[PDB]
Amino acid sequence: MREIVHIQAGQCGNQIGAKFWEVISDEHGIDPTGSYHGDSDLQLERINVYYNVPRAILVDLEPGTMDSVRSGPFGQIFRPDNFVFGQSGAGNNWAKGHYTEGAELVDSVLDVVRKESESCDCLQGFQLTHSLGGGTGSGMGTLLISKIREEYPDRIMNTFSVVPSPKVSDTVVEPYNATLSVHQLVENTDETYCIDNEALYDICFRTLKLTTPTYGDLNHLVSATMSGVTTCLRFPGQLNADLRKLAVNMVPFPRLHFFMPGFAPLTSRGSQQYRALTVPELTQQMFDAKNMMAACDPRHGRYLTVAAVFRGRMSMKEVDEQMLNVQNKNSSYFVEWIPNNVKTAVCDIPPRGLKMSATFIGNSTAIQELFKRISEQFTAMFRRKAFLHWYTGEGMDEMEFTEAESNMNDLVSEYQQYQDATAD
Amino acid sequence: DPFELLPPSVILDKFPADFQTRISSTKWKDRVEALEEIHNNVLKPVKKLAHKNQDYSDYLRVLANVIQKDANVQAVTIAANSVQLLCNSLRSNFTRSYGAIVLVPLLERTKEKKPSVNEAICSALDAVATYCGFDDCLEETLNYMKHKTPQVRIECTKFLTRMLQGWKSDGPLQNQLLFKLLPEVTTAVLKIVNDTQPTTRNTGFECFATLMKLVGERELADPLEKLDNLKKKKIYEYYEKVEV
Amino acid sequence: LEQRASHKVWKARLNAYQELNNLFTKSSVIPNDVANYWLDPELFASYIVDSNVVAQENAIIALHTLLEYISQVPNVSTSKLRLQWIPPLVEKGLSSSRAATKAKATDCIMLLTQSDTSIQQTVNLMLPSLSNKLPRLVSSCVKCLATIIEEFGFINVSDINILLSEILEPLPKLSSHADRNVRSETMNLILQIYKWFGKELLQELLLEKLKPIQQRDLSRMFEKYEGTIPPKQQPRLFQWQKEQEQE
Amino acid sequence: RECISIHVGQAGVQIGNACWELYCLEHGIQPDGQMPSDSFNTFFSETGAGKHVPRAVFVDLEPTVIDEVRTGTYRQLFHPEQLITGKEDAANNYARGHYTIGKEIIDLVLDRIRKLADQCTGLQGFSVFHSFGGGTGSGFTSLLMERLSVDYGKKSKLEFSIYPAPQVSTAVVEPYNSILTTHTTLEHSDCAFMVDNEAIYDICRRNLDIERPTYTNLNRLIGQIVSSITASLRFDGALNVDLTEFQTNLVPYPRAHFPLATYAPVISAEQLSVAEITNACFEPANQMVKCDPRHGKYMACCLLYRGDVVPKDVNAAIATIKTKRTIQFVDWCPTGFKVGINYEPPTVVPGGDLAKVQRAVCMLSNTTAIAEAWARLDHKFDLMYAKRAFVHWYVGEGMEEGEFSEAREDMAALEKDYEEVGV
């Protein structure tokens, strides 16, 4: 369990994807030319995970995105062969990404995926970044996943999927596309970090006091969360080391693998962080719902499993104390029938900008609130049958929408069942 | 459908180095353990031996050497049970070389009267018979009915009786039984029917009533007449109660 | 649009498949020389692997109705068909994740199985797929093998001993396979062999080699089975058998 | 009388390093294998060039841990064919260790064991080092133990298990893996010494004075107590001179073969009497498994002293405890404490936080209070299996779900077995 193949699909996919590579290239001490100018061994200890030059494949039906990446800061480092791009765009139609246009290109993508996997000592799994309200990131992404799932069934599938919100785009077909994609991810991926644009806006607007957040502002919150959750994977460490071990200790029931991520402290784009937080302060950004990257209240549900990643030089004695504290002083919020369900890990190398930081990966039943929002919007749209002729024209059947609607509601019911469960 | 389709097992690799000297040793318990090991550890487990390219006619000719000549009755008993296992788990193999290598030794050793030993020798002779039909046994079984030991007469004649009950050769007529019926089979069974001992004669009486059942109580009415009226009603006694 | 069945755009192939499906139901039973999807079976062998999941499913239901329009005389050329057709059907039809794409592929194999004299020419072609990467394929094609038996069965099969050995060989590995479904659906195939032979035979060659918990479940499964050791009447007949019954 | 050691999973492999580090210091053996100086050849073999090689196999379904062995201080000590690694680990899943991944490498492992057993003349048996909660430690070991009971069935096999503890726990499913291996390894193990990582943690925080112990801290402490048990086999003592004697003295019931080990003294590196250290053997604070022997009956009890010890001081310390404490025994047991002594001093590691002590003792006692440890695992197990939590991971890697229940019933039956002896 060593290498990870990375994929980014759709506009958002390549945006937060490149942003992720910007962050972790710095953290590992790699320049845009692809040469090591670091000064520590803890950096190159597990550089073979994401690098060889990135093990990254760039995909979009929109050919313009090609240039938006290469003209970016670290755009020079990506392998030219790993660029696979179509002629036209999907235009927010999941069916075009999943059945028609995205399907015609998906073969060319699998050829590059094969090429990168072929020269791997021992593959771990895959990593996809994309948006769920689009046509390419959702439609072609979910189609790529299934196509990989069946070509590489001995590997983990881990996605960074961002949820659409009216606060970021007023397109009304997004409830359709996202619901159809959740119907896919619940069956096709081992673990999925739920990035909610609703929560990214509410954090940039209310906590960071930015009146108009841009994509870059929301993308800053994402790339830092990604580097936080992938800290275990990229540096030496005992706990939650590889993709499979993580999912083993996080996902008790296969369908309930949608994590509510959140991290601290919340900083602005390049602002000045004069006063470093204390260990008890970081700890009290867990239940603090203003730090969750998903728009849910942990107080309204119960945690099945929790993984905490503390970055920076600090007292391991104090972290253990604070985590053991916050668990038992809120014992009614953690499920009793899974003992030692919270797991903490420390990494001495902090993220750039911060002296200390802490990311809070949680499988909380409160996540059902997120799926409620998508379902109510989907049903409001679907009961009036709006814009269906787009999807049906591309070969989809009206039945598909009803199945995805019901399958997501079953997923909501499941979360509610284990919320009301008792150990007795 | 025949359950015999099971994959074949090989036992040559199972043999130990200290086997050839142990079986050809002067100490009885060396020989016993040698045979008893390859039987309980190597033969008894298996259920189908390897038909293809396996020569057992080196192993089988040393089972014959002991069944015939070995003075230890215990080493004989465990050897004839080994011989049976080979003939049982490897059906259709004992065509001539194999069948004939142990046949005439087995018939010599029917002389043994210990119940357990006669049990094993006869049961082994039943194995070679059921898989060598009438190839070499029919001629040689007769030869040993003419033998001087009383016990080999009654046992080799009982053998022909056993075989005759399981006689179901293919074809309408002109089998090996008819080519030599009156010339040899009947002339030899009468030597048993007219023996000095009663228990010997009484085996012939069955072995003649099992013969009539096969080949018609009318065809053999010629030597029936030459027989005593007193022996006749004993032969008929078995004819009424004997099946094939 | 006859040659458009190989056209570049998907939605024009989707038509040609519907056009064909309407033809094989509305064409003549005696059959137009236009019905030449027998002498060149590479054509539909290509169509079943359409490269478009929606137009694929429509090619399979066209093959399906084709493959029952052929139930009339003289079509002794069903040998060539099973060779050309069921490897694509198993490889990429049973494989499919689509509800309907799978269901019609199985039904197709049914019709190709009863085109044959027995089940032998069908099993030997779909046996290799048990050794495939994808579990849901071996998960499925063990279910499909199991129901070409429960409805047809072994009759008119030359040398059955060679055939039973060929299908019993992988059953140890299948029952120790990682996938839950591959295992669960292998105990069903074991029962369907028990349901047709005795318990004596399986326990001598196979049951010995499985996990103890497994052979318990197989025994528990035989008690719930009621009916004579070989089934008295098959739930489905072949083509030469039904015609013989009629005359 | 040769004895082969096997190390499975990171726990086994990394504790192995600590033990063979400590064995080579006790026997004056060099990192390169040489020796400027038999009873100790129970564990080591010899090259024609005067080099002393361990009789050991290292196994992990993953290179990382064993790669550090063959590039470490003791890279020259082991033959490269002894260090075996796969590529995909078991990922804290007993199923992968036992069924899916373990079967891909089990034959290579058994083959390399035959090469060490072929060098040996009168092989005694096997010592096995592995974790409970690990996927490799639970799954692969239980598989390897099954196969060793065939290929070497007529000889002994001893366990050194690492009982899990939330303070260093890497997985939620560690109760599952513990129960699953203990079920399938119960019939194939003759005796098994459990090591509660919590007690080793507690000891290192109290007596070694460490805030947050590392694995090196725990392993070194563990290696000291493992050495005390294997000292009788390596120096030709009077007690426990071969692997059978462990079963004879400590195992009066095939199933209940889990002794409680207590070690004194643990002195920080920043002398006591024979009587003082023997009283600490009946103090729960110095046990390796957290329980209360006062709530249980003793089936057997051995004392392994080593160092500056007068045999009469022992008998005084024994009579003191036999009179001034109430150690309850079972009625069908020898009421006498077995004893053995080895006058060599306890070796520590140069640099270790543990100090050189004049004398030391390791008490091995098969008390029924160790059932409390099984109750803690079974209870944790019950909570998660009541909702069938995490069960799909196991079932998806070649394991039948029923095996969970068959294991739990075997653990419930073992809890009754401990009760009936002690009433």
Ligand SMILES: Nc1nc2c(ncn2[C@@H]2O[C@H](COP(=O)(O)OP(=O)(O)OP(=O)(O)O)[C@@H](O)[C@H]2O)c(=O)[nH]1
């Ligand atoms: N005392 C001690 N415990 C250890 C050590 N290494 C691991 N453990 C414990 O063993 C348990 C399982 O971890 P591992 O032994 O590394 O797992 P593994 O055997 O390698 O199995 P996989 O990694 O899943 O393939 C954890 O609960 C750890 O606390 C060690 O060196 N010393």
Ligand SMILES: Nc1nc2c(ncn2[C@@H]2O[C@H](COP(=O)(O)OP(=O)(O)O)[C@@H](O)[C@H]2O)c(=O)[nH]1
């Ligand atoms: N966080 C974030 N979300 C984005 C970004 N770009 C688009 N989105 C969201 O993704 C959805 C649009 O899908 P998009 O990825 O642009 O379409 P695609 O190119 O076909 O994959 C909407 O819900 C947007 O809010 C971005 O840069 N950052």
Ligand SMILES: [Mg+2]
């Ligand atoms: Mg776009």
Ligand SMILES: [Mg+2]
């Ligand atoms: Mg490990």
